[PDB]
Amino acid sequence: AMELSFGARAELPRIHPVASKLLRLMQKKETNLCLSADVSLARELLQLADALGPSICMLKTHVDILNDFTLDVMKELITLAKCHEFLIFEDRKFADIGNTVKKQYEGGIFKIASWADLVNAHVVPGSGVVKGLQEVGLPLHRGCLLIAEMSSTGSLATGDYTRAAVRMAEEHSEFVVGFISGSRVSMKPEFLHLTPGVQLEAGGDNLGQQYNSPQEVIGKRGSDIIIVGRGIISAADRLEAAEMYRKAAWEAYLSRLG
Amino acid sequence: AMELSFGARAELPRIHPVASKLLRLMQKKETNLCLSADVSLARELLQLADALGPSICMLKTHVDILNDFTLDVMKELITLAKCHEFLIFEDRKFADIGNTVKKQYEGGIFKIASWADLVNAHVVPGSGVVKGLQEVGLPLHRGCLLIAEMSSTGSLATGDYTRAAVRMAEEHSEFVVGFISGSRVSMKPEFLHLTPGVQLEAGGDNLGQQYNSPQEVIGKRGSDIIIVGRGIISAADRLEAAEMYRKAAWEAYLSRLG
Numbered sequence A, B: 001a002m003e004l005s006f007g008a009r010a011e012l013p014r015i016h017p018v019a020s021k022l023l024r025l026m027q028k029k030e031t032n033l034c035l036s037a038d039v040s041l042a043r044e045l046l047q048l049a050d051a052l053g054p055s056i057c058m059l060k061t062h063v064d065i066l067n068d069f070t071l072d073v074m075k076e077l078i079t080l081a082k083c084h085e086f087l088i089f090e091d092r093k094f095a096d097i098g099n100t101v102k103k104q105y106e107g108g109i110f111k112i113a114s115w116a117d118l119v120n121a122h123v124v125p126g127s128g129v130v131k132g133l134q135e136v137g138l139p140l141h142r143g144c145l146l147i148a149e150m151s152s153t154g155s156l157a158t159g160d161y162t163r164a165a166v167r168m169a170e171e172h173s174e175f176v177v178g179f180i181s182g183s184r185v186s187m188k189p190e191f192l193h194l195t196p197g198v199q200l201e202a203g204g205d206n207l208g209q210q211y212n213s214p215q216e217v218i219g220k221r222g223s224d225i226i227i228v229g230r231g232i233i234s235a236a237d238r239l240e241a242a243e244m245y246r247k248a249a250w251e252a253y254l255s256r257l258g
């Protein structure tokens, strides 16, 4: 295929409204940066969302790490998402049978479906995992990302595992909008590719995380969006760091567009 | 080779303390039944744990489906666990990079490590998932189960994936006490095998769950413990249903012991 812009893909025929909403704000704001807001305090989550909101297309959460979660916190996050124009991605990694994951998505204390635009799923259980999430997510106009590859050393999400992930996406394109992957895994331009394991300096952490640059992941490997946690969160000035990552990911996307 | 009793297995030189405690109470109470307590209310959770405690070796939770979770509820559950003698297994299925899963296990609202004897992890991220959990579990004297196979249709946890799970468990035996699997996957008697997707009658559900009988799973496939949810919970008489499952699983274990 030849390279389409985020704006062209927003306008496509088969595109999920969520993905379309995302691709438009990306074009509008010149950002393909997803902030991984891996903090344990609501006040910090909310201050990051507000400060960095203009710089990001998406805020990714791990609600189960928030020491002071309440649905009111999520209400305030929604208000910031609407105000600054970004989607909320809860990185819950649903990975159970369909009958269980539907309850874990709809219910409990988190009520994830009520506030998350996007969630993700591991494909290891078979397509039941997507079917269960769909029953809840479809009417709510939510979307789902399938984990086709992981960034960590020893990752088993390779080969036929990755190919099964892409098939599963194709079979459920009414609800699945794309992939968590280290590179482009599907040529279909309606699918989003989001890549974690990103820092300016290629490298890793002490527990198997691997990092590659925005230029590599977006430019060479053809992914759409970078997911960045520690590369931003650990900085003294998280706004400056966010801006650095945004320009890098954006300029890398412009480059491959030609 | 020659099958050892649960009582003898509990005394093996390399046995993990949590596995030893469980094997002891299984032999004492003549139960290799784990109740899957898939309910949405604390009261239902506590009611089932009390009513069925005598029949079970283990209660498996999904605390993220509890509408009214609080840590006090867990305190109470533990009192029941200590009174009736069963372990608590939170079926969280950790499946993220090591840096993330340690926070998910220790922290947030659920504080899983503060009350769960056992948790489980998917192996797809590589062994960094176990190394992260260990940082939290080992100080708290906890154990972990690796998901080597799944019960659901289209499961990708097969062949080399399954073998990678077994290797990973062998290499982290200070923390990993066994497997979620549909059959015996390790020949080392220090490892436990727990099998979900169990009902007396043939079948499945509308979202990819598949059922096999206790005699099939324990007797022919050589697993140790049956995990049963709806097979008990949906029955009119849960005390009778729990007893039927216990007696099925236990006699199947005795037969294989010869």
Ligand SMILES: O=c1ccn([C@@H]2O[C@H](COP(=O)(O)O)[C@@H](O)[C@H]2O)c(=O)[nH]1
Pocket (backbone or CB within 6 Å): A036, A038, A062, A091, A149, A150, A151, A152, A180, A196, A197, A198, A209, A227, A228, A229, A230, A231, B096, B097, B100
């Ligand atoms: O394959 C994956 C999938 C998800 N994440 C998530 O993306 C973020 C990476 O953060 P950092 O390593 O950039 O701090 C974390 O929240 C992590 O859970 C990965 O790192 N790799």
Ligand SMILES: O=c1ccn([C@@H]2O[C@H](COP(=O)(O)O)[C@@H](O)[C@H]2O)c(=O)[nH]1
Pocket (backbone or CB within 6 Å): A096, A097, A100, B036, B038, B062, B091, B149, B150, B151, B152, B180, B196, B197, B198, B209, B227, B228, B229, B230, B231
């Ligand atoms: O491979 C697996 C792993 C876990 N479970 C869990 O075991 C229970 C099965 O319940 P039921 O089908 O017996 O009601 C559920 O809590 C489900 O999440 C499975 O069914 N299959």
